[PDB]
């Protein structure tokens, strides 16, 4: 839906998502979740308190939309966390490699995601500013972003 789209802002960012992205401080986090993650329960614990959506799109498409406006904290710390595949900390899934492309495109440099164990990922998610769920059905399609700061 293109309805109500604004000038030079990715139309996939709906009003509730734009609000969250703008209201977050430097160092605040958000989760982009797939359809598998328990987004409803986890979102109840976040600052926003309800699940936000970039619906029907892949995790990579969601990442592209979010990073088109959101600076990442890359100059100061690795700023996109991914889930670790069980028993294989270095393994990347197709859904994850696609998302990495969007991060590197937004940064204009290599910015590899850092791994987070499943349990730790859930606990970090509960401390996020918001959860933004997507149409991503593939396993391990969740990411933890840390907002940076524009000079």
């Amino acid at each position: 839906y293109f309805q109500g789209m604004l000038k030079n802002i990715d139309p996939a960012l709906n009003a509730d998502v734009l609000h969250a992205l703008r209201a977050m401080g430097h160092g605040d986090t958000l989760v982009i979740s797939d359809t598998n993650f328990p987004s409803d329960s986890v979102a109840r614990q976040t600052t926003v308190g309800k699940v936000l959506h970039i619906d029907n799109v892949s995790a990579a498409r969601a990442m592209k939309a979010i990073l088109s406006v959101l600076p990442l904290d890359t100059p100061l710390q690795p700023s996109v966390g991914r889930m670790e595949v069980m028993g294989a900390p270095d393994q990347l899934e197709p859904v994850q490699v696609e998302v990495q492309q969007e991060i590197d495109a937004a940064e204009g440099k290599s910015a590899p995601m850092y791994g987070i164990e499943r349990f730790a990922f859930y606990e970090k998610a509960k401390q996020a500013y918001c959860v933004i769920t997507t149409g991503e059905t593939r396993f391990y399609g969740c990411f933890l972003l840390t907002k940076g700061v524009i000079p």
Copy 2:
């Protein structure tokens, strides 16, 4: 305050204003108000139901920020209304000429504001999606914008 600013989005647009601008449909209206207008009472009647703010800035600075993201309905109808100076429908105040510059800059063509009588302006304001007040202290510093549509 630059805190939390996003990439390529005028930082004067806070989260509540960005939300409103994105959530409005084609043909929805908003009021940019000066400090003189009864923004609190009028805003209670709008869709948003509370006064939004681009604080401390002039009406023209507010217009610049809003039009940096908001398409106007100019291809279809005159899309910025101004208050008519009492007994002088064609007269423009300094606050109004400044705002016209921002409109023409955003449109890249001449798009003269249309006049609205005081009483009509108030009644239209009550039907707006939102009122966004500013630091504009000068008289007649209120405007009625109509959202357009991007192809």
